[PDB]
Paper text:
Mtb persister formation is dependent on the trehalose catalytic shift, a stress-responsive metabolic remodeling mechanism in which the disaccharide trehalose is liberated from cell surface glycolipids and repurposed as an internal carbon source to meet energy and redox demands. Here, using a biofilm-persister model, metabolomics, and cryo-electron microscopy (EM), we found that azidodeoxy- and aminodeoxy-d-trehalose analogues block the Mtb trehalose catalytic shift through inhibition of trehalose synthase TreS (Rv0126), which catalyzes the isomerization of trehalose to maltose. Specifically, TreS-catalyzed isomerization of recycled trehalose into maltose is a key step in the trehalose catalytic shift that promotes Mtb survival during stress. Although TreS is not strictly essential for Mtb viability under favorable growth conditions, it is required for the formation of biofilm persisters and can therefore, in principle, be conditionally targeted as a persistence factor.
Previously published results using Msmeg TreS unambiguously identified the aspartic acid residue corresponding to the D238 residue of Mtb TreS as the nucleophile that initiates the attack on the anomeric carbon of either trehalose or maltose. Therefore, we constructed a catalytically inactive Mtb TreS-D238A variant, which was used to obtain a cryo-EM structure of Mtb TreS in complex with a trehalose analogue inhibitor. Following multiple rounds of manual and computational real space refinement, clear density corresponding to a disaccharide molecule was observed near the C-terminal end of the β-sheets of the barrel where the active site of a TIM-barrel fold protein is typically located.48 The observed density for 6-TreAz was stronger for the D chain of the tetramer compared to the other 3 chains. The 6-azido-glucosyl moiety of 6-TreAz fit within the cryo-EM map is modeled with multiple axial hydroxyls as that is the best fit. This higher-energy conformation may derive from steric hindrance between the C6 azido group and the enzyme active site residues, or it may reflect a conformational change in the substrate required to promote catalysis. The structural alignment of the published ligand-free TreS structure with the solved crystal structure of wild-type TreS protein incubated with 6-TreAz shows no structural differences. However, as shown in Figure 5C, the 6-TreAz-bound cryo-EM structure shows significant movement of the L19 and L20 loops at the active site along with the H9 and H10 helices and L8 loop vacating the space required to accommodate 6-TreAz binding. However, the E280 residue, which acts as the general acid, moves slightly away from the ligand binding site to better accommodate the ligand and afford the acid/base chemistry essential for the enzymatic reaction. Additionally, D350, which is essential for coordinating ligand binding, moves toward the substrate and forms a hydrogen-bonded interaction with each of the two rings of 6-TreAz.
Numbering used by the authors:
A (entry chain A), B (entry chain B), C (entry chain D): 40 to 586
Write the structure that this text describes.
Amino acid sequence: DPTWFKHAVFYEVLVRAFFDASADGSGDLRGLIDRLDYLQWLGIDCIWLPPFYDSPLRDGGYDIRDFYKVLPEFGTVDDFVALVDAAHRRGIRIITDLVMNHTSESHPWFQESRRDPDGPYGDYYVWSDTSERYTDARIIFVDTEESNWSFDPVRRQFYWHRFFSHQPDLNYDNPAVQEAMIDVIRFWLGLGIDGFRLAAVPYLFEREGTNCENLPETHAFLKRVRKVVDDEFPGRVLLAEANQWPGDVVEYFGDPNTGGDECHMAFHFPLMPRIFMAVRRESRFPISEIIAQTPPIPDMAQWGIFLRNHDELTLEMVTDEERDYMYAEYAKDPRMKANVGIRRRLAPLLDNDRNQIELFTALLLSLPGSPVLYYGDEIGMGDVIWLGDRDGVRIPMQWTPDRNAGFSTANPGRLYLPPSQDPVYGYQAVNVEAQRDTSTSLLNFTRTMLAVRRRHPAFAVGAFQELGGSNPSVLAYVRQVAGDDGDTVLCVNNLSRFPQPIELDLQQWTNYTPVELTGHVEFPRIGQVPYLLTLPGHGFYWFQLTT
Amino acid sequence: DPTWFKHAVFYEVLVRAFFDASADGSGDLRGLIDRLDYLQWLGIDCIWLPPFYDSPLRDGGYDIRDFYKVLPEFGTVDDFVALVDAAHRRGIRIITDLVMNHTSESHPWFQESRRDPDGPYGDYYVWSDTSERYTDARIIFVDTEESNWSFDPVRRQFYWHRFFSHQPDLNYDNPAVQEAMIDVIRFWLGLGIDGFRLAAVPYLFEREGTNCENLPETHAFLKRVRKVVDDEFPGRVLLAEANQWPGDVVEYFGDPNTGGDECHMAFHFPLMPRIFMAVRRESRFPISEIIAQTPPIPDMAQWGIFLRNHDELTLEMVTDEERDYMYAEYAKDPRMKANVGIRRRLAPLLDNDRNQIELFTALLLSLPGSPVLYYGDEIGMGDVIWLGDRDGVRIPMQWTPDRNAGFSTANPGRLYLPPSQDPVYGYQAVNVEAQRDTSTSLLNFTRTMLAVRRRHPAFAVGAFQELGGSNPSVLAYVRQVAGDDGDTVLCVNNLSRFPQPIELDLQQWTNYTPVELTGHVEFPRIGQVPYLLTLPGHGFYWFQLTT
Amino acid sequence: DPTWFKHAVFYEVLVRAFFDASADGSGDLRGLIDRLDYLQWLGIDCIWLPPFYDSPLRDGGYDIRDFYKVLPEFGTVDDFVALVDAAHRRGIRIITDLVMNHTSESHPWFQESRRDPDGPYGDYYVWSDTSERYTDARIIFVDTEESNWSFDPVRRQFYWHRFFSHQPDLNYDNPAVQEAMIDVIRFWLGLGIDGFRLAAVPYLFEREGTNCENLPETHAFLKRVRKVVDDEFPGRVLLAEANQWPGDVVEYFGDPNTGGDECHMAFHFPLMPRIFMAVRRESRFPISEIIAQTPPIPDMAQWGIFLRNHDELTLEMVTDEERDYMYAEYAKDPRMKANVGIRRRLAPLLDNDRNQIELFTALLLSLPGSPVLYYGDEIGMGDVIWLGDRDGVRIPMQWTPDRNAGFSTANPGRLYLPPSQDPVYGYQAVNVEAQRDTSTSLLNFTRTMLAVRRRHPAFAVGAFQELGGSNPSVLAYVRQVAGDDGDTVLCVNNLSRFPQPIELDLQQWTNYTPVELTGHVEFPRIGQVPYLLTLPGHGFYWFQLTT
Ligand SMILES: [N-]=[N+]=NC[C@H]1O[C@H](O[C@H]2O[C@H](CO)[C@@H](O)[C@H](O)[C@H]2O)[C@H](O)[C@@H](O)[C@@H]1O
Ligand SMILES: [N-]=[N+]=NC[C@H]1O[C@H](O[C@H]2O[C@H](CO)[C@@H](O)[C@H](O)[C@H]2O)[C@H](O)[C@@H](O)[C@@H]1O
Ligand SMILES: [N-]=[N+]=NC[C@H]1O[C@H](O[C@H]2O[C@H](CO)[C@@H](O)[C@H](O)[C@H]2O)[C@H](O)[C@@H](O)[C@@H]1O
Ligand SMILES: [Ca+2]
Ligand SMILES: [Ca+2]
Ligand SMILES: [Ca+2]
């Protein structure tokens, strides 16, 4: 089969908050095989499932306690196979997250470790006295944790946790830990899962003096894992994560000369915190510059464009000291979660204003790379920030407006979370049964946009070239495919509230007719004088530029 | 200013979960000034107040981080003074809870007692070493903790935490820790407050080998505190928290010869878990043996009868292993915590019966000693087990059912907890506005019972006699007041679903006419032959036995 | 089953307001066969059915527009045959209504008579030329109608409409209409149902001079119709209804000598408007004296008691000026419709005193008449009284607290009348699904009472002796059975709020042990001296007087 990660849109279907198929007030794998038709109807080809393993849910389940067993709440591991079989016989791809760099303080490998120095599971985790080692590494959570080392009583030594107080980072130097964190990678691929993500890759190895992140030793292990995947089972997308400066530190794609020997796909973290900056700043540079700075990429790796995920809009080092602008713009009513992010969903971030919403949908549907959509955001939900942790972005999705937002058929007290009841973004104001009918509802509009993004095999294997006109508050680009008689396209996105005039310079494509895509309204021929256009506030076009 | 310990009913109104006059999602001390009228309309005279001092609300508010300032959320201390001024004018006495056994793991004292001993606060806490010390007392919370000692990374030593490990018990041997705690009272009593309820008194001074509870020396400091209270600001009702064996230890009153030199009252903990095990077993013995097995009390103190409070429900740690059938009857739900495991409220306990609830309210208002009323039992409220911790019995009060249970005028997602929404026990099925007009509604039955109990001073300062009869499924009293031509009264409470015939033994009162208290419908004159009555399921009468 | 109506309980179920099997917005026969398990689980044994024939729904569906056709929106004759052949499988018998003395002004008969003064249908209706004939009848609908003669301008004459303006009376003097009015009965019986509630019987023949009510010829015609139903289709009952003064005015049974040659039952309108005044007046005279003033009955006919039906309280023509008292106690607000009973349902009539409701259910199931329950009395349901006319007593049922009270899944605008929403009465507070769990719910209490009443063949086929004591405010019965070792039964019912002593003279049953029925709690053996029982306010006992 083809590369299939160049042409695809990913969905973040949290196994929780989607559907309760047994009245347990929580998600369920067998509860997703019954709503695996809303996805196909929506036109989504690859599904992405965050981890669901045996893990006391102290932090969104990223506290694995066993990498060999499905959490009993979310059905057995004989229901994951059913989900895979049902999502393969319908034309959908599912990738399951795999997280390294930690383990909950309950895995036998840790309890039997702190209680048994010199035992086999003795040096798996990082144990070393003193609070001076790696004294230059930054601290991520500037709210809960404040030491990054902590103190373990039973052994009285220290331990190395990079994320929380109950997540001891594994010491990968021990050449036996990198045979039990790789035997998992060689097991789930045996179930037929098509590719698996890698989470928190930059923080694996840490050595003194350096910054402790993205050391030139993680990449050796990544190359080893990629070679293992290639030799054992070909054709899987080892999606990755960077959240680093664009530079050369985000490129985990391997040596360009070979073409690819590492992660097949990254995430556009450098650009995610700048789309909003550009949109509110009424300009296009905060996006054009960021797309220009990033170096080139190999010929067999996509770029993973996206807007929001199950995190809090990580406004970290990725952004320079202009964070003081986004704090004062998107973070009034203090809700700064740590020094990173704003902890708000897409729709609330934009005053629920529809125009900005479809503008951003177009921007993530056209810019270089495949899009990834959070399970909501196609209805206009979110908010409910006041809950503990960053759990204002994991409320159950709001289907039909019956009791408990049609999530399940149990008591409204047994639900693991209460469906929102905001006067605006409530479960009685933004539904799925109240939007699948109206032909201009946001769900249907995004479905249409997806529909017109599959009839041009030029949005996924194309190119990028910013044309630019006199007006600085609007950008344009041409996703032209390669070869003779290219499947050229055009895009002209506004970035201001009002309507503006644009003087494009498409003379390089002279003798071309800009056939529209919304309604096939043949526009004026591409003359030689400055091409002229006039757009409304937050408006956009998707031309075709045919001969 | 009389004793008033006896002629008084107590309301367990939490500062939170009651009202919200600031539109923030939590009870406010300004939320009681404009609501006190309702209490005066229900027939109450003394309004209780659990802890509300400046503290992280990590457990209830007993995790005190300061003993001198009100929590900033609940207004300011001037608001407390205004509450006192506007509640005394109605003749309602306010008494606050007071926790002195411990302060939270954030108090200035604990911090300066950590990381740098040898200072003035070096031994404001019980600092020890090794897990062999005071190794006789049981662990209370046997569901979360496992060791009861804990550690400390900044000093490597151990601290004797008794409850949770974030509010370590103070070391009471110093004549400095207990010379400031007796200043907290010095301050609070200066605002016009009326007494205090000591929290977890038994767990003062401990010594090796003993059980650390009820040690002969705690009473020394108790007598000192009583002398302090009496000498300055005379006439303030104290209380106690004695969850010990019946009368064997619970006896916490001063020398009987000298009248009284300890707690001015007490909470009849040994009785609570029995009012239930008698009604379920269809017999009266368990309510009689343990009401007689208890020794007497000094004739200057009451006996604090209550039926439910904010706890794990029916504390079952001081009753023999034959309270192990209050798991197969009252705890069918597989959710039992803290070695007793019910965590429900009064109404859901009694299978939602309108007869049993009224029977239990009658018993509460009838048995010896002044009663304590829990805030959510004059409506018929329920509970939510699946809320974690004992917070399931602290859901906000369900007033009018319009919006978020009329509790507040803020976002439904902003409240600290979601108002109950069960089909049977919700802010729609049970309300105050929906039960404040229709007679026979519990809010009116209880009001009438209280109004009748405030006109016959024979339940408060009266004697007690168990008439007994041929029927082993009904209990009778005579709450006569000792004296010449006193105010006699009778009570005959059934304990069986089906109707029963009763043959009492009132021959000691020959030639008295039982003028019934409800409507004054006279009865047959008492004759030398046994007096004969019949009752339906779970019924009662309150005869006046006039001359 | 020669009679089957002595050991039977009837349930009035309006075909609308009971369910919705096709999302129409109204009842449905296919929406009733689905629910013939809730009725069969309750214990009902003969369903009831008001009018449903093809007709405009201008007057509660009593404006017949055809006789052989089922209303289009209730299904077809196939659906009715399915209902009859299903309910006849679960030991359930169906009896339908029938209208004889009116026909909406849309029937082909009346449209053909309106014009064409000479013709086959010219004498199927009453017609005159001046409005003086029959000047001694009653204006039943005193509120709207004012003359009782209507003009019909097409013909320029006068017609004599009994009840309402558009309901012209038939003319039974014609020897032809008495043939269609028997063919309709023959056909409807031919479908398979058994029984008929001959309606508006005491108005058929309108003679000159007299009041036009109970004219001697009416009984002759009824004798003819009963003979018709008896000679063919043997074994079919046929009820009746009077709403007249007790005695010969309710002679609608046969000639006592012949056993019976008229209606097989009757509706005890003399007594229904008297239970309420007996209970609210705190006495027993209005019930016992009235049950004694009713003349005897033919030995082979039941008496069919009830408590409330779909009409108003109908307190007129069967009540003296004592009704002037009831208007001042049972309806203080101006909600008295016509010059007859009030438009309120049982529950709201009494307030929510569950004791009163239980007492009324006991009286209904105990007294001589066979019970007739009305849907919505089985639980505590309210009634909206501003809906106009008398439809406020036929609100749609309330099954569950889901959307539109779980009545129907259709859009919440189709429903003819919105489900109630009052704070005390509503579909959120009194739901047949929120009361099927608790074992004290009014629904369960009624089910248990019906279950017990079925085990003693002495509540329906037994005699009736009143006893009387010293208190007027109590009622006593001994429903003995003729013959040796009949299932004797005693009943004591209170009628005063406060508990009462009660001394009865049971000297005729010496040496009889009163075993109670609810729990089998044996009572003291019957005493030659007055038996003494003490009963709580609004209470009752059902002893069995075994040997
Ligand atoms: N905060 N923050 N930041 C972005 C940073 O961290 C993420 O953390 C998420 O994933 C880890 C993986 O276990 C999980 O522990 C956290 O709960 C999630 O918020 C990403 O892992 C990482 O790639 C980002 O750079
Ligand atoms: N669990 N429990 N039990 C009974 C307990 O009652 C008091 O406990 C008070 O203080 C604790 C400490 O936070 C609090 O959790 C309870 O809600 C309070 O009632 C006393 O500690 C003692 O009498 C009993 O052990
Ligand atoms: N009310 N009232 N009325 C008179 C009469 O009512 C019953 O008969 C019918 O009366 C009208 C006309 O159909 C309608 O409102 C009732 O539902 C019908 O049953 C009975 O005959 C009896 O209640 C009264 O005599
Ligand atoms: Ca690491
Ligand atoms: Ca201590
Ligand atoms: Ca007539």
